[PDB]
Amino acid sequence: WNGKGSTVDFQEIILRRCYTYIRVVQPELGDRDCQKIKKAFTDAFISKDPCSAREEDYDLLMKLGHQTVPCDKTVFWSKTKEKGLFTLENTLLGYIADDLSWCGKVGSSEINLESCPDRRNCNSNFVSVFWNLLSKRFAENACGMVQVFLNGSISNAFDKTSTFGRVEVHSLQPSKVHTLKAWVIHDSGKTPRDTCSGSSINELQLILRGKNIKFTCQENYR
């Protein structure tokens, strides 16, 4: 395949990360069991066709790793990726899986280090489905005021094809989320390629006004 092979020692890595999370990152959740989680993660894809992944294969995992973050604390970053606030990667599941690569193989009781199909090889691969589902859940459990950081140095800070624009924004619950604030970051070093007054951000605004959800956009250098 074209995608990265599984991360070596994948099992050990997620086991470690998980504990470090429930005893230090958010002691708030020391009640959870890491070995149980690791088993579910692995059971979800091991020895399976790497292009047959379904959201359902992660039910067990999403159940054992569920966690609702404080309202007003939910934050989104769209392609700007490069305190006491939760972004998808700061949650339990996003935390341990972050930056890792994984996929099984029919007939194999282990991970495939050689290669894994990426989204362009097949959309239904285990890494994409995972992240796609995590994002969906993260957006559905958002309450109060949500935020999203966009890059003012690119032509279209708000992309309708990104995870945020095609998945997350639409999964926000109007009944739980009343306002969405967008921050367009600008480098004092260059002029804005896109601003709050652009058509890209207007596309986001229309999405939100359709659901009567309040929207605001501000520009920051920092």
Q: Contact 196/219 with Cβ under 8 angstroms?
A: yes
Q: Please count the other Cβ atoms lying within 10 Å of the Cβ belonging to residue 175.
A: 8
| Active-site residue (options: 71, 116, 196, 217) | 71
Separation CA 17–CA 27 (nearest Å): 13
CA-CA-CA-CA torsion sign (33, 56, 144, 97): positive
Mark whether 34 is an active-site residue.
no
Which among 169, 182, 164 is positioned nearest to 218, based on CA atoms?
182
Pairing of strands 177-185, 75-77: unpaired
Count the residues in the chain.
222
Start-end of H helices in 88-198: 92-97, 126-140, 163, 169-171
Which among 110, 100, 106, 120 is positioned nearest to 52, based on CA atoms?
106
| Active-site residue (options: 34, 143, 196, 217) | 143
Token pair belonging to 23: 């005893």
Q: Which residues are catalytic?
A: 71, 143
